[PDB]
Symmetry: D2
Subunit: 293 residues, 4 copies
Amino acid sequence: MKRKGIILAGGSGTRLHPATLAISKQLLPVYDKPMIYYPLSTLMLAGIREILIISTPQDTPRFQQLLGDGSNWGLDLQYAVQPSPDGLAQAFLIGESFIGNDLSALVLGDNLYYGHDFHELLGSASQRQTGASVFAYHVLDPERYGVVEFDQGGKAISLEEKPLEPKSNYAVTGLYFYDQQVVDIARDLKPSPRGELEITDVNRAYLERGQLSVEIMGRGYAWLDTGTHDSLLEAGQFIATLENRQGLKVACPEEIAYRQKWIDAAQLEKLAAPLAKNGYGQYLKRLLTETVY
Amino acid sequence: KRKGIILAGGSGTRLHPATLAISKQLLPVYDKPMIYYPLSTLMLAGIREILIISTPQDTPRFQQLLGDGSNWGLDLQYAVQPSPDGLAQAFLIGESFIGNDLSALVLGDNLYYGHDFHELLGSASQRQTGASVFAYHVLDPERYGVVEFDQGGKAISLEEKPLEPKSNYAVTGLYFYDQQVVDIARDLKPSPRGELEITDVNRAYLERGQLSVEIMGRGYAWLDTGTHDSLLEAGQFIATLENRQGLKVACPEEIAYRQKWIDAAQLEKLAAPLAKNGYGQYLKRLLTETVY
Amino acid sequence: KRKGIILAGGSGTRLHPATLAISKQLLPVYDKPMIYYPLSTLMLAGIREILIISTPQDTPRFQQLLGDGSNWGLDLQYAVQPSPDGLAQAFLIGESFIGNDLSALVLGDNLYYGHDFHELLGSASQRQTGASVFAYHVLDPERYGVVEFDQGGKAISLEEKPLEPKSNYAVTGLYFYDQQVVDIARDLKPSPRGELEITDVNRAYLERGQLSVEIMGRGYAWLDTGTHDSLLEAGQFIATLENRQGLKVACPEEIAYRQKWIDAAQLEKLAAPLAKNGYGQYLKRLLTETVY
Amino acid sequence: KRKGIILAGGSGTRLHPATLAISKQLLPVYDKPMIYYPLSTLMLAGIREILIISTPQDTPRFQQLLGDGSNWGLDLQYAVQPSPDGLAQAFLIGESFIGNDLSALVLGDNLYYGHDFHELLGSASQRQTGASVFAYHVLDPERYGVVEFDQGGKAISLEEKPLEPKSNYAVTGLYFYDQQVVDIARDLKPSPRGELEITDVNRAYLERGQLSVEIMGRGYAWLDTGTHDSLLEAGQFIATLENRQGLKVACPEEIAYRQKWIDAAQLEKLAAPLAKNGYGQYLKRLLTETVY
């Protein structure tokens, strides 16, 4: 079966104000491209082409000016609104229609992943047609996240959203794969105390049925989020140092669509033209004549 | 009375797609909009009435962000530059705003930092005839207007983006003008870059013996935020200073309060909505801490 | 078993006068001495018997810092290189250390990070024939050995610092060799730089169809610290990973404990003298924490 | 004439295991050894006769790096601090060196930067009585000696690392004294902390009304490089400045040359050995360029 993708890019701007008074978080660039390009690329890497972008009323159209219908890139992009930041799990209600009876995946708009064989990392959750899959990453500050505890032999046994007393240092990252059950599970949720329809609650509903797979995203991968002013800067220096060392870009959607045969040489050259004066255009052009392994 | 102009225009293409959603001078430098930095330079210069010139598309955004200025004791006006045909256009678009007064222009992506910037400025601020500009030693003079000095340190020439720069002293993006400026700009023809050049206005004043070129010393940081790499360095530079000091660089509310353009009750009102983050926490602390 | 060599020598003139004080490979990269990185690399390759070759002045310092290696379950020995006469000299200097064994040489200023590095290394290490090198996509191939591939992905040429590189794929500072290397290096002659070149050794294997070149993907970071700018960038990179993860990159005590080369007891004892700092604390937490 | 002391000692625990190999004041801040920075500060104060105090292991390493100073027109000497028991030991260790002169002390890991620092220093240095220190707004004053002022801006108390700082003004690591210092140091008794405290020397001057506390404004950067994080920040700070400007911060040869302590011929000789790297090219450029 076919899997559809959602990017949740909405949310409170009150935190990063006044920095984000003119531009919301996921519309800011990370080094040399819009934040949203990173998670989008994530979904492309997992082989997903039909993607729903959920944002604030005010931001939806911006994302549409930026990305279009996605046909330029071999994608089918649609848009929906989150009237109010009332929980990541609402994504499934906003998207019920878009999901239909298909499998799905959700990624958070400010989640930036980097590393080797992200294809094989995703591939495996991608292929599971029953149940749900999530990824755990070792962090310094687990209490800011959904936290997954494991027993002595490695199996996940508990989940807790932002525990005052975390049971482990493994955070659940902002990338989740679901089967056809997810929308009915979300339907039944009641808001937590902190006023939110919790993605941790969905994931636990699968876990309590023995249907939650928890994969380790190893320390050789970099999972960054653009939470704060200090974190955005580190994410920018991190992308800059890789890009400048390699002369290759991270998370360039045009490149990915081309590597995946979603667009052809000819399509890519058309994308390159209007960018020809700058480095991003120059990059795309180099890609039609260079083999990159 | 010196009136101020901020010019925040500029051809987008370079930085796309990064700035596809948002113009460069709308991006944050660390923890605050880029425009706050040149706005705060004018405020430091004692200028309260300011004109912000942007593109048709970015003008409404600057207004959304900044309003009419009254919250900060300022009088902010807006005008549009339909096409990027040179910085000197600001004086034609700004003719009526300027009227018969002195002026100051600053470029919207110039960030300045250092000690006694308020005295560095007041100096040019207070000469009522002529024009004044600042020269700063850089690695890449060719990217800028360049000022050549004679053996005795007197300015003798200006060239816009010269192939063979005659010195390493770039003219920075901050300019002080007397009443002659609008007419000087009225009589300029485009350059072979196809622009109405600020270097041409400054040279017109030089050719009348009426240009003052002050040295902006190497103890001041003059940063340009308009490449991806340079914006990152600037964000890091501000970050290091703010985290070391627990003070903010170029916080307009703070400067306006320090200048008595707003009172305590007004600042308290500014801090309210931001109370839930670090910036609001900052504004509140300024009501009760003495900072030298 | 394969034996390892770290060539940690040279001037580091690009690093004057910072290295006037201390040798580049002794400078830290963020929180640990630079040499820890190439050492950790060897350890991840399964290598425990390692020869550290450095200048006559630094050798005793390396010796002071790392000891005989027993503390970490290793066998560390030391030799001097009298003048920076080429990386291929490691094989003559280290002739007797190698004996009749497989070997590996890593450069002292190269750092590697990435998922499954362990398996990427283990694969080259476990080969019992020919030579293995890794090719990595870079923006400036003119600074390294450059590998060219035919249309089928087969390596067809190698060049040392070509002014016009035939590809963007550089040969990284990590090399694995069978029993053929000492005798190949014995017959090398100096090059123009005036160096016995590792590239010539590697072309000698390529000529016999015995050089395995594996691509090290863009999902890996390969950085080197041989310029002021590059050392800065490398320290930030590490900082950012370790501060996010609450784990360390290239911690030899960790690695040695994970590979079972030392036990809990041995580990707790390494940590104690470092208990007042985060490093010690870090080693201590490893006893009680499971890290996948 | 005023005599200068650089206290470059201490363990560097916060910095392990990074500093096992080398002391923290030998580590680079971007492009030159950390010690260059306080050395530069004393030179900018017009001080040419300096005593470098360090641990017994680091003394020889500083001697090998700086020598006797004659190449830079300075007169450098060396002494050892047996154990890190307080900044104020520097005055007992350096008793004979100070003799009957004015003196100054700077910490080896403190870096200063900003416009007219030259003049800010020279004013304290040129004073011929009492004690002078500088106060600087920080985010974490608990780590420093902290100065409390009255409602009129007058320093009234000093506390060493208070849990509840009375203000956010820290005492930076640069101190100027008259001939009273040595006898005052002679009378101190170890603290709680267990050190002979500089803060107690300063309070003794304050009790006699003879401590001048000047504000170092927010327009100056005062950084310390005593942790792995702070060292990274400082190097990035210097890099941004030096890459923007095409000039160097705290280059001793430059400052010596500018002060007329060494001549053109002497300088050209300094550059030669460094000619193949940037630092050398920079000294050479200073022979022909006018820098304001």
